[PDB]
Amino acid sequence: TTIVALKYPGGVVMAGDRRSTQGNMISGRDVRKVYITDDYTATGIAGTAAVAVEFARLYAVELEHYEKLEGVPLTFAGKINRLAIMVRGNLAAAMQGLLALPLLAGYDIHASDPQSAGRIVSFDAAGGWNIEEEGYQAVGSGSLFAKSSMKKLYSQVTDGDSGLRVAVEALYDAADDDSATGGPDLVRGIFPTAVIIDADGAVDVPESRIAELARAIIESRS
Amino acid sequence: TTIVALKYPGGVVMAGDRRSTQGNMISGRDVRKVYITDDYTATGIAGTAAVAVEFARLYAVELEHYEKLEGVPLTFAGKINRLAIMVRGNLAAAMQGLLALPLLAGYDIHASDPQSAGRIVSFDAAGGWNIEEEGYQAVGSGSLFAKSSMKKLYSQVTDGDSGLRVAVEALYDAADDDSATGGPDLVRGIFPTAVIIDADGAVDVPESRIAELARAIIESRS
Amino acid sequence: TTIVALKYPGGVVMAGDRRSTQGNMISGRDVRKVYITDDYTATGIAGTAAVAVEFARLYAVELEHYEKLEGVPLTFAGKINRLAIMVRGNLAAAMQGLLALPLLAGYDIHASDPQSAGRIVSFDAAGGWNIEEEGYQAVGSGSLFAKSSMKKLYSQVTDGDSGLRVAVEALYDAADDDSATGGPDLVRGIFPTAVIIDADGAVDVPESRIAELARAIIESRS
Amino acid sequence: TTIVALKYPGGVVMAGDRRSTQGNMISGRDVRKVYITDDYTATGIAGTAAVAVEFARLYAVELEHYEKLEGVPLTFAGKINRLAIMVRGNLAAAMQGLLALPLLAGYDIHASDPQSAGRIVSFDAAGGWNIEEEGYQAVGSGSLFAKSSMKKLYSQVTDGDSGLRVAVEALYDAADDDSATGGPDLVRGIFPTAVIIDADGAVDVPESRIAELARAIIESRS
Amino acid sequence: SPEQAMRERSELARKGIARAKSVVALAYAGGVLFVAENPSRSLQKISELYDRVGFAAAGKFNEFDNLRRGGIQFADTRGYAYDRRDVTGRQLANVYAQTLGTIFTEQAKPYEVELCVAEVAHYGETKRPELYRITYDGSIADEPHFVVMGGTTEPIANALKESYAENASLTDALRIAVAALRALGVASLEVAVLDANRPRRAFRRITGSALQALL
Amino acid sequence: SPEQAMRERSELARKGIARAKSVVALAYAGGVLFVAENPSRSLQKISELYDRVGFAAAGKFNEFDNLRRGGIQFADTRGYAYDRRDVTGRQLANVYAQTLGTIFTEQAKPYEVELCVAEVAHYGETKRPELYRITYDGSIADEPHFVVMGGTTEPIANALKESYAENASLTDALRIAVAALRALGVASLEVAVLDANRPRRAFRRITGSALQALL
Amino acid sequence: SPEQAMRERSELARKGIARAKSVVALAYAGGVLFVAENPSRSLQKISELYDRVGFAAAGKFNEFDNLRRGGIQFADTRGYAYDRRDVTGRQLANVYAQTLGTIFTEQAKPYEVELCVAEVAHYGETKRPELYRITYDGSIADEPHFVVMGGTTEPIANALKESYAENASLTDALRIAVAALRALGVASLEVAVLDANRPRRAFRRITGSALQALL
Amino acid sequence: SPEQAMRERSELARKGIARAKSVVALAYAGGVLFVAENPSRSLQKISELYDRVGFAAAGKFNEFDNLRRGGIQFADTRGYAYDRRDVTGRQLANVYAQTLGTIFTEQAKPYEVELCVAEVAHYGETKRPELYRITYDGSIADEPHFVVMGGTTEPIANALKESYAENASLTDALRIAVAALRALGVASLEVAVLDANRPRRAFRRITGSALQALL
Amino acid sequence: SPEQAMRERSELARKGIARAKSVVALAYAGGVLFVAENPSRSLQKISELYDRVGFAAAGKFNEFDNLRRGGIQFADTRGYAYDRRDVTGRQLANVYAQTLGTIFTEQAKPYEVELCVAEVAHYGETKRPELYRITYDGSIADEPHFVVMGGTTEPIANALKESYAENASLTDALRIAVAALRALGVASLEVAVLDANRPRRAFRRITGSALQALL
């Protein structure tokens, strides 16, 4: 598994691959790992698939529960804290193989400069969190290759489409170097999922656009 | 043990073998592993026979209990979630040795397209679930052979009869490559149990049709 | 220990050997392992002798308590479920060494056909239960030898007397091959115990009839 | 990581590096390890970054909670006792690897002599604390090199500026001898964080001054 | 004075029962028929307790809905513990009697409810349906033919006695039940049957166009 | 006031048992005979406690059914803890007396019940059957010949006193008990025996054509 | 005495609700419209319970705010345990009825509140919105068209009955609701809608310039 | 009579408030000003709850001191669990409403307290200060301009109403508050400000020479 | 009636305190002086709470001894949890106010006590002694100069007001206190001092020959 997130002028993008393996056997080919947690936050969990899904569900329920109870949504720091507390509570089961590594992407609607309102938050195993200023982050087994690809392609990022292209290319490199991350399946028509967050909110990227980007990348590297 | 499930236009079919072994010794020859959980969902549990029967009974009781209390049946996602919660709760025993892996076949009456209402949900060891889009799924010790047989035979599935024939042949292949899976016993007259779910509901396939299909498959492979 | 049970037209018969051994040393020579639980069911428990006696007493108490409280006895399925719950509640003691394998013979008075109303139920260590359709079953250390003897001798079971003879002969074979099973002791005059259940109820066979059958078998084997 | 603290005539200064590692891989480049706990106390926690941030937040919350409840801020010995209690109560979790070692710098407002009101408190693993009279202290993986550098450089400390320069030079030496401590990174312009506490309170040092001092030290050693 | 306390407690519960819509349960050839005058389509006074066991109630809705949920829990727990065939309507009636007696004596306010538990035979078995009526104080009675609960039950009971006939068809029995209730339309009628012809689950709701075509 | 409160509680229980159908338990040659007037075939006032110990009750059904279940639980637990032959009618009567005394003095309303516990000798043994009568307040009495509970007990008690025959057969004893209750056909009559000639379980229900022929 | 005590609790709760602002919840083409005269911009009598389930209340603020928080907790737990589409307005209304009945009978002071639970159909589905009114004692009713709570609800009920238009537009429905409520202005008015045309969450607040334009 | 219990409970609490010193909280250009009549420099009626949230109370000191401690605990827990900027004055006011309602109904003696929770905008942000008044029975109100406490509040509130100036300076607001409070020197006066221009903690006490120069 | 109950409870507590010996705590140049008329040399009405905090009480001995032990436990726990210099007289006085409020409102009988908590400055610091008077109902007051407790306190208070002298010597303060307390001998007097000149523990008893010389 590999989930990449990167900031671009005016927002943030978050892409993830689709493969799920148990050992070496490919058990899933169309998993979705990027969830729109709320209107301005996407979350993506790497690690055990079951724990990833249940953590996404718990986090979305918690955020909406607070918003309904108190009439106002949580601040971004509050969301980060709730996610970090969930990770810290999971630590014990994470030692037992039920690991979950979240990556949080958001748009700070209360930020002074909306062109720099995108936020990427990474979490370590102990439950600590860091707001990335380098502009990109990755989680999962192929996260190192994806990060080292984004380090060289982040200069290209200038808008939403350029950021999305770099995100798919980072995922392509991760899948190229790692057998637990799935590359673009031109045979089955399965491509990485992506979410784009800007001032207007968090929207799922249509599959056709990612298909075009992936085919362009494959042609480029042929 | 092997339980196969596959989708055909207009419904789903779930079939299972009959053998139960204690190590190398064949204890049971007529075990029923496919249960009509309710009028539109059937479940089949592989692993320990005691845990399989207990899970089937407890899950059916839970579904009917909810329907009687609230005056309306659970949605399909709710049924999947209840089964997943049972699987996740059985984790300590599964580590101890009481493993139970379920496979769920259903008909979503609330689906937009009746012809695509057939649903197959596989559950992993950790409780996570996945709605199969391949159209076929198998659980048990012979599940790999059955899945790789259906991968080749699935193009022949066009209705309930062809789907049932393909399920029986997949069970035959699983028993051919796996000694814990019971093949068609032409001597004792014991054949796999099948359940077919369509718009009218879930109904057990009579023993005679499965016997005819198994005899045809055996004669073809002779 | 070996306890055998087999069906004959019109009822069931359960027979058990008399030896109890602690290690290699013969401690008991007239242990009674078959109990008339209620008017139509008998149970025989192999394994630890202490657990066997305790479980038989507990099961009889539970059935009688239900009949007295509710004014009507349990159905056969209810009795099977209670016994299986008792077995499942003994896994920790089984790992500790206080183990018990029950075998249940019964006569379903609510069964539509009287001539097939006999029932044999076998339980495994995990608590699962199985209603036998092959007509015979055995539990204990010599259960394999007794089962393989009954497999060849079951064709000549036609009534209660021939079924009793076949049960005594299976016990003889189990004793002949397993040192933990005691055969007919012609010196002390100790013979296997037996219970016959038919439409009139469950009755203990007098020791004289089993003595005559065992003497005939021994004379045949010389 | 390394956090140094030293007293100068008229107050105390406390500096910390910026690097966080996971093994030998660098994962954080601008971690902030020195926190202004209250108007006259700063704390700096070495060890696991998650536990460091958690400890700083909890300690500040506890101090402010007391001040609001009782209407008067804790005496300095009270603050030391609360921090020592936290460290003692984290011993079991530090035995699993969630270790945290704090260093406390403060300005006692009740001290008769303003020129000797700076206080440095070091806490050992088991919760014991010592008020340093030598005038300097360090915690972290590079703490020994920083301490031995401050031992030689402490005769140059006469005011806040020279104290800050000596603290930055001690951090430079710790980073020079220890790979888990981040040195002045001139490429990205990331420099150690510092806090100066005097009679006017505790105030963060602007990054420009620390950058100037780091550049002067680098030039001197070139 | 405990005598006066119990008398006024009973008066309160009985008066609460009096100003509630009536329910009739009767035995017909196919099993048991429940007819209630229930204007709402969402708050159901007739429910399935178990496969062959059905529930009817009259009075305050929340109280007998609590009782209905408790009885369903008891039935499912019992059927899982022993067997589905081991659950009878008499055990549920006795549990309701115990619960209602304890509530009447000890609770701050007694339940102004009146329950009927109806049981039919299993599939392929012959047995006259059993009707048990349980009152607010826990008094339990066996009714061989019909039960009338809620409202002024004397006129409805008298109409039933003058118009009841054992081994009647579903249509006719429904006509008698509606006529006895009048002493309504497809709306303001909730109708259900414990249908002894079903293999496992006897409860069946008759609503809407089918109810009109049966009425 | 304490005396007044206790007296009114006592009168409540007495008036509750007064408006109840009567039960008789009398010792005949083969054991003990219970005869009650009971229209319901499912709500049974006469039951078995243990192998040779039988139960009868008069009053509010739910209360003495709860008491009967408590007694059965106690008897089964005690028989398991020590032995079946260590369970006797006297211990069950004593636990009933304790329970009813606590209920009378502590519960919000006292139980409106009167219980009878009967014991017969074990198989192959000669011993006069023991009859214990227990009242709402916990008072326990040993009766040598017969026990009459519920309803108006004076006339039926006098009829039994004048007409009771020692060591009578089952037919004559049943005739005497039925005539005493009359002062009633197979329907509306529940009859059972603790039969001392049975090997293990004495309790046996005389119902259907057997009662009709015997009556 | 329990009857006098229950009546006095009823009078207390009824008087408390009668001296409160009025709330109107009425169904229109787009879903359900809530209009409550609320001078405060922070304390809100109208809120969201779940995706398609909304909440209105009248009476003392802290009591029905406690009820609102309990309902939100119940709905979130229920949706997590099974699924979001398994949470209905009927279940929330039933929970509120149970809670308010228990509070009325047992608590030191009964809640002086009246609640409306409203549900609209899921996205891309046709269904008449359902309105459930729950009173202070737990009495639960299904109102097909509109609910009025708080104050003198009778003139408002008569005006709404005379002026209710099925399948009206949002602006028309606001006109009729505000007119019946007057029997005010944009300020001192809280307006919300359960909008059936929303993809997932139906609740939406209409306040400020949008409300003035609509009103 | 529960009505009489509630009304004399209200009389007790209101009379306790009546014989108490007066407090005034008013919004001004720099935030919120609290002025209380307090002869003791040790016992404080004005206090800080959270970074931008301040607390004022009138009545029996120990009761509202317990309330203030509970509110500080709640605010600290809420800030630590989510974030410092997720704590508002509305949440604290709601907590006080629930607490005071429960105390008033359930406890032996109600609390003779009257609370005001004030919130100012965060640093660098513009927002009118919020003032919430909570009464002894749990009632909560949003006062846009000022809150008055303790003693006879009618003359003080009338003088404040006639003389209040929105967006006044600190000197002007202090003079206005003291003049309205008279209908007082550095002694017998507790003065504080929620100062909207402070970076994090807005609460600041104005005593001694600074208060002398300001007054 | 809660009002009547609280008023008669207050009457009971005041009557209990009135029939008791009197205590005076007055500030002088060296700290605080406690003088009590107490014949018993074994049971002490004046004790030390903490290093610079002293306790005096009037009323029933067992009640205020329980309070004294509780306050000592609280002070020691607080000093160990944070520091010895974090314990102040005001915190102890607030704890006593909370304890006495809860006792007065909830316990069957209110404590007939009247407490004074006195605090002197630490060694090397010049701060005015602070005295807190806590009454039976939890009311707490700052007394700047002296506290008079128990018995008929009006004449003693008047004498102290007329004859007080700030910064008086120990002998002058003791003589003035004895003179006011008469309005007798050296025996039947308990005299103690919070002496601000002590390094750590200020409390010091003055009995026997030293007391004779001092008076």
Could you give the angle at which helices G2-18 and E2-18 cross, rounded to 10 degrees?
50
In the 8-state DSSP scheme, what is residue F152?
Answer: -
Measure CA I107 to chain center. 23
A90 three-class SS? helix
Q: Which two tokens stand for residue F42?
A: 């499912």
The answer to whether E40 touches E201, Cβ cutoff 8 Å, is no
Residues, chain B: 222
Name E183's bridge partners: none
Q: What type of residue is C205? A: V
The answer to whether G80 touches B68, Cβ cutoff 8 Å, is no
Q: Which two tokens stand for residue H42?
A: 């040790």
C88 touches chain B (CB under 8 A): yes
At residue B207, φ and ψ (nearest 5 deg) are -60, -30
Question: To which residue do tokens 């596959």 refer?
Answer: B6
Of residues E4, E18, E33, E14, the one with CA closest to residue E166: E33
In the 8-state DSSP scheme, what is residue D190?
Answer: B
| C73 C-beta neighbours (distance < 10 Å), count | 19
Q: What type of residue is H27? A: A
Distances (CA, A) of I11 to A55, C84, I4: 62, 71, 10
Nearest to E80 among B61, B68, B71 (CB): B61
With CA atoms as reference, the chain D residue closest to A123 would be D50
Q: Which residues contact H35 (CB under 8 A, 6 or more apart)?
A: H23, H24, H25, H174, H177, H178, H181, H189, H190, H191
I201 touches chain D (CB under 8 A): no
E209: left (phi over 0), alpha (psi -120 to 50) or beta: alpha
- Alpha helical stretches, state H, chain I: 2-18, 61-81, 89-106, 153-163, 170-182, 209-214
Q: Which residues of E touch G (CB under 8 A)?
A: 5, 8-9, 11-12, 40-43, 60-63, 65-66, 107-109
Extended beta strands in chain D, E state: 2-8, 11-16, 20-22, 25-28, 34-38, 41-47, 100-107, 118-123, 129-131, 136-140, 193-198, 201-204
Name B92's bridge partners: none
Nearest to F72 among C57, C58, C65 (CB): C65
Q: Pick the catalytic residue from C1, C2, C37, C193.
A: C1
| I10 C-beta neighbours (distance < 10 Å), count | 15
The answer to whether C167 touches C8, Cβ cutoff 8 Å, is no
Q: What type of residue is I198? A: R
Largest Cα–Cα separation, chain D: 54
Cα separation, I97 vs I91, in Å, equals 10
The answer to whether G94 touches B72, Cβ cutoff 8 Å, is no
I30 three-class SS? coil
Those chains having 3 or more beta-carbon pairs within 8 angstroms of chain B are: A, C, E, G
Cα separation, C69 vs E78, in Å, equals 14
The answer to whether E61 touches E43, Cβ cutoff 8 Å, is yes
Cα separation, E168 vs E165, in Å, equals 6
A102 three-class SS? strand
Q: What type of residue is C126? A: A
Q: Which two tokens stand for residue B194?
A: 């099948």
Could you give the angle at which helices I153-163 and I170-182 cross, rounded to 10 degrees?
140
> What would the DSSP string read from start to end of A177-215?
H-SSSPPPBTTTTB--EEEEEETTEEEEPPHHHHHHHHH
Angle at F171 between CA F169 and CA F177, to 5 degrees: 100
The answer to whether C106 touches C5, Cβ cutoff 8 Å, is no
Q: What type of residue is A204? A: D
Mutation target for I interface from H42, H45, H103, H190: give the one with most I CBs within 10 A.
H42
Cα separation, E191 vs E178, in Å, equals 10
Extended beta strands in chain G, E state: 23-28, 31-36, 46-50, 53-59, 113-119, 130-134, 140-143, 146-149, 190-195, 203-205
At residue B16, φ and ψ (nearest 5 deg) are -150, 155
Cα separation, H11 vs E103, in Å, equals 37
Q: Which two tokens stand for residue B185?
A: 């016993």
Question: To which residue do tokens 């696991």 refer?
Answer: D48
How far does A217 lie from chain B, in Å, by closest CA? 27
Q: Do E140 and F60 touch (CB under 8 A)?
A: no
Nearest to B81 among G82, G88, G91 (CB): G82
B130 three-class SS? strand
The answer to whether A18 touches A32, Cβ cutoff 8 Å, is yes
| D2 C-beta neighbours (distance < 10 Å), count | 31
- Ordered by start, the domain boundaries in chain G are 1-215
Residues of C in contact with B48 (CB under 8 A): 126, 128
Q: Which residues contact G184 (CB under 8 A, 6 or more apart)?
A: G37, G178
The CA R_g of chain D, rounded to the nearest whole Å, is 16
Measure CA I10 to chain center. 21
Nearest to H42 among I2, I138, I142 (CB): I142
Q: Which two tokens stand for residue F207?
A: 């119902």
Residues of H in contact with I95 (CB under 8 A): none
Distances (CA, A) of B139 to B168, B170, B202: 14, 12, 20
The answer to whether E47 touches E69, Cβ cutoff 8 Å, is no
> What would the DSSP string read from start to end of A17-32?
---EEETTEEEESS--
The answer to whether B4 touches B96, Cβ cutoff 8 Å, is no
In the 8-state DSSP scheme, what is residue G107?
Answer: S
Residue I180 has, within 13 A of its CA and on its CB side, a CA count of 31
Question: To which residue do tokens 């079946």 refer?
Answer: F84
Cα separation, H13 vs D218, in Å, equals 72
Q: Which two tokens stand for residue A123?
A: 């979490």
G120 three-class SS? coil
Of residues E61, E87, E60, the one with CA closest to residue E73: E87
The answer to whether G104 touches G147, Cβ cutoff 8 Å, is no
SS (H, E, C) H155-197: HHHHHHHHHCCCCCCHHHHHHHHHHHHHCCCCCCCEEEEEECC
Q: Do A74 and H82 touch (CB under 8 A)?
A: yes
Q: Which two tokens stand for residue I98?
A: 């909370």
Question: To which residue do tokens 């300001």 refer?
Answer: H214
- Ordered by start, the domain boundaries in chain C are 1-222
With CA atoms as reference, the chain E residue closest to F41 would be E142
At residue C133, φ and ψ (nearest 5 deg) are -105, -5
Method by which this entry was solved: cryo-EM
Mutation target for H interface from D37, D68, D72: give the one with most H CBs within 10 A.
D68
Cα separation, D82 vs D66, in Å, equals 11
Q: Do D65 and H69 touch (CB under 8 A)?
A: no
At residue E64, φ and ψ (nearest 5 deg) are -75, -20
Cα separation, H118 vs H143, in Å, equals 10
Q: Contacts for A201-207 with beta carbons within 8 Å, 24 or more apart?
A: A201/A39, A201/A40, A201/A107, A202/A36, A202/A38, A202/A39, A202/A40, A202/A41, A202/A42, A202/A107, A203/A36, A204/A36, A205/A164
> What would the DSSP string read from start to end of A106-141?
EE-TT-S-GGG-EEEEEE-TTS-EEE-SSSEEEEET
Element containing residue C54 per DSSP (H, E): helix C49-70
Cα separation, E46 vs E68, in Å, equals 9
The CA R_g of chain E, rounded to the nearest whole Å, is 17
B99 touches chain C (CB under 8 A): no
Residues of H in contact with G106 (CB under 8 A): none
Q: Which residues of G touch H (CB under 8 A)?
A: 5, 8-9, 11-12, 40-43, 60-63, 65-66, 107-109
Q: Which two tokens stand for residue C140?
A: 């204990």
Q: Which two tokens stand for residue H52?
A: 């931008």
The answer to whether C150 touches C4, Cβ cutoff 8 Å, is yes
The answer to whether D74 touches I83, Cβ cutoff 8 Å, is yes
Of residues F182, F201, F205, the one with CA closest to residue F193: F205
Q: Which two tokens stand for residue E93?
A: 């009636």
At how many Å resolution was this determined? 3.0
Q: Do B53 and C133 touch (CB under 8 A)?
A: no
D1 is catalytic: yes
Of residues C40, H135, E110, E139, the one with CA closest to residue F59: E139
Cα separation, C75 vs C88, in Å, equals 20
Cα separation, B205 vs B161, in Å, equals 11
Name I58's bridge partners: I114
Residues of B in contact with G86 (CB under 8 A): 74-75, 78
Q: Do G109 and H1 touch (CB under 8 A)?
A: no
Measure CA G179 to chain center. 18
Residues of B in contact with G91 (CB under 8 A): 70
B139 three-class SS? strand
Of residues B125, B92, B100, B123, the one with CA closest to residue B49: B100
Cα separation, D86 vs D54, in Å, equals 11
Cα separation, I207 vs A102, in Å, equals 73
At residue H82, φ and ψ (nearest 5 deg) are -115, -65
